[PDB]
Ligand binder design. Structure first.
Ligand SMILES: Nc1ncnc2c1ncn2[C@@H]1O[C@H](COP(=O)(O)OP(=O)(O)NP(=O)(O)O)[C@@H](O)[C@H]1O
Ligand SMILES: Nc1ncnc2c1ncn2[C@@H]1O[C@H](COP(=O)(O)OP(=O)(O)NP(=O)(O)O)[C@@H](O)[C@H]1O
Ligand SMILES: C/C1=C/C(=O)O[C@@H]2C[C@@H](CC[C@H](C)/C=C\C=C\CC1)O[C@@](O)([C@@H]1CSC(=O)N1)C2
Ligand SMILES: C/C1=C/C(=O)O[C@@H]2C[C@@H](CC[C@H](C)/C=C\C=C\CC1)O[C@@](O)([C@@H]1CSC(=O)N1)C2
Ligand SMILES: C[N+](C)(C)CCCS(=O)(=O)O
Ligand SMILES: C[N+](C)(C)CCCS(=O)(=O)O
Ligand SMILES: [Ca+2]
Ligand SMILES: [Ca+2]
Ligand SMILES: [Ca+2]
Ligand SMILES: [Ca+2]
Lengths: 342, 342
């Protein structure tokens, strides 16, 4: 009688029960044979492996029988119709869930901010999306996708620390650098100024303690790493930055709702957790938009879990109860019911 | 009967004869006891040493008897009255010149561009000035001085190459790095973009051959070095950059002539020889000025020698012949004649 909420990400699975303020279980989306990531850039690409992960969610992490709880899952924006159907098939026929639904992650994040209209920036471990949303529906022609997120940043941080004399190379060491990224990296309001402070003084330098007790210093790397979000060619990508893509996204929208989009930039996901990221987005967006445009960036403290929380909220909504797909419905109709409904 | 033109700089002496398109002699402003630079930041600070240099100019470089040629000398903008008088005293009483004059360097550069009104940027080896000029006279309340020029850049280039694995440390090696600076450095139109090209590809890398035959590669250093002109805090200076100081200089001027200043940015001196420096000044000045402002940067090809050439031109002008101070005048009046005249 309690709904489950399962948020499948490229790097982390967020799972728990609808009606809770936070997921009870957060764990890595990996299977080992060497580690495989069954979710690449927000999309499921190995189904056997994904089954093992959902099997782990039910029986190990949450400790519930799947056939007893309606289950709300999440999908990346622009997730192919065929992918969504396979997900539905696995849930009802492998796991015997009594009901389910598949929600778009970035919309859930918007709901968690107490909003139904806005433009979300959702940046995770494997993909970055700009998702314009009007009255609860994502506008698919205007969604932007950037294949650059936290894992790319971490690798970049491994590369640039190497040029300071450190040798971070192994996949175990990649975990240590992810940790440094999360404790020590921030977004410079102005990249040049920051490089010049760091060139001429030690005021931005931080110490980090390694597992074995050794202490190292990191400098301009702190902000050079997440700077790649605004200038992706730092790792050889031609794409525009997250500021430009927010702008391009808003511009693919009907002029009537663009003011509301600009006033409602919601940030979502672990890779939007960099201190200073909101002030830099404000400043960058300002520079591209018309002079009179009211620009607002909302960055909730709990935005590592926004998608999950939006799910918890939706699953609990009286209005949403009519939208669950029941096993009866599915076994009667066919995997198509996941259109004229979801 | 031929006038001499002697342009005394922090690093190089430019000397020759009025009526010529170029100085016949260019040589370093040094005395050795260890090398001393008798001119610090454009100002003469050792007089015995300066006498040796002028003695070298007359007898070794130019091969003329001083008592036979009117001699035009140059001074930094804002050169103290007392300094100018000592110069005059040495010329007439140590060297027995039959006539002389002391001209402001940055005005000469303006004249060499065929102009009497404009704002000069004069950047040498030891000092950088912004000099607003209206109808032939420098406006002293509006002159900006920056203690950052080519020698500072070269040292900075020695420091940053060291962090790439090279060890440029000795004063002999400092000459090699000055040479690299002059053959290989340029000004990025956009610093960030350039850092990102250089981080992700080898397309800005250049080879340089050392005297002993070894070949080295230099990368982002090419534009990181002269970038210090626009962002001086890269070497721990709080001053504004050459773009900001041009702006601040123009703003200390009467509103009536500011349009003419903006339309007439003349660049002068070796440190304005960086490829791309004119486009970057255009762009930076544009960003600070009002939207409607006609901005123009004039960068003559011969601007390493503009000061000298302006001197050659002035010394040859029929209008200027009344302005020479003769030895007769001086021996009659006193070193003050260098006001109600010069
Ligand atoms: N404080 C922090 N600062 C910067 N990055 C962080 C921080 N905390 C977590 N992250 C990054 O957030 C990423 C995972 O966040 P999450 O929003 O769960 O992505 P996900 O859903 O697994 N991947 P995606 O499929 O791209 O949505 C990892 O790369 C983390 O390193
Ligand atoms: N192609 C070039 N690119 C960059 N810098 C250059 C180039 N050629 C010469 N320079 C620099 O120009 C400086 C000397 O130029 P110059 O205009 O003669 O200065 P100066 O009069 O001796 N010094 P100052 O007293 O500051 O005017 C040296 O630092 C050179 O390295
Ligand atoms: C606290 C934590 C957060 C996390 O996000 O882990 C996820 C998943 C993790 C799986 C691989 C490691 C060995 C398995 C152990 C995990 C413990 C959870 C680690 O690989 C990431 O590190 C990748 C690699 S480097 C990066 O930036 N993303 C993201
Ligand atoms: C072609 C050339 C140009 C020049 O500008 O020399 C001047 C004067 C020079 C004097 C010291 C050396 C050893 C003496 C030899 C000179 C030959 C002329 C050198 O020291 C500079 O190099 C300084 C130091 S490093 C720099 O950036 N400015 C500028
Ligand atoms: C304000 N902001 C966090 C963006 C920059 C501060 C740099 S630091 O954290 O003090 O090193
Ligand atoms: C155009 N400008 C000279 C400023 C930059 C070109 C860089 S490079 O000389 O081709 O390496
Ligand atoms: Ca996610
Ligand atoms: Ca780019
Ligand atoms: Ca000079
Ligand atoms: Ca500064």
């Amino acid at each position: 009688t309690t709904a489950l909420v399962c948020d499948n990400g490229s790097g982390l699975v967020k799972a728990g029960f609808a009606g809770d303020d936070a997921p009870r279980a957060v764990f890595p989306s990996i299977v080992g044979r060497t580690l495989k990531y069954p979710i690449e850039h927000g999309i499921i690409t190995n189904w056997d492996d994904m089954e093992k992960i959902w099997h782990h969610t039910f029986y190990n992490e949450l400790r519930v029988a799947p056939e007893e709880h309606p289950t709300l899952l999440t999908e990346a924006p622009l997730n192919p119709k065929a992918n969504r159907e396979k997900m539905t098939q696995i849930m009802f026929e492998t796991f015997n869930v009594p009901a389910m639904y598949v929600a778009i992650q970035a919309v859930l994040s918007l709901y968690a901010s107490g909003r139904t209209t806005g433009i979300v920036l959702d940046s995770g471990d494997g993909v970055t999306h700009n998702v314009p949303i009007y009255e609860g529906y994502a506008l698919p022609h205007a969604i932007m996708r950037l294949d650059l997120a936290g894992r790319d940043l971490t690798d970049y941080l491994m590369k640039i620390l190497t040029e300071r004399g450190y040798s971070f190379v192994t996949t175990a060491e990649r975990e240590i650098v992810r940790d440094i990224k999360e404790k020590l990296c921030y977004v410079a309001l102005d990249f040049e100024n920051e490089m010049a402070t760091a060139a001429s003084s030690s005021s931005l330098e931080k110490s980090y303690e390694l597992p074995d007790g050794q202490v190292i210093t990191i400098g301009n790397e702190r902000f050079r790493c997440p700077e790649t979000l605004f200038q992706p060619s730092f790792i050889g990508m031609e794409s525009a930055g997250i500021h430009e893509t927010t702008y391009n996204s808003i511009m693919k929208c009907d002029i009537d709702i663009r003011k509301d989009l600009y006033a409602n930039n919601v940030m979502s996901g672990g890779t939007t957790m960099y201190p200073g990221i909101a002030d830099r987005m404000q400043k960058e967006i300002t520079a591209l938009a018309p002079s009179t445009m009211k620009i607002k960036i909302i960055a909730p403290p709990e935005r590592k879990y926004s998608v999950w929380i939006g799910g918890s909220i939706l699953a609990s909504l009286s209005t949403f109860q009519q939208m669950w797909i029941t096993k009866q419905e599915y076994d009667e109709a066919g995997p198509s019911i996941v259109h004229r409904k979801c």
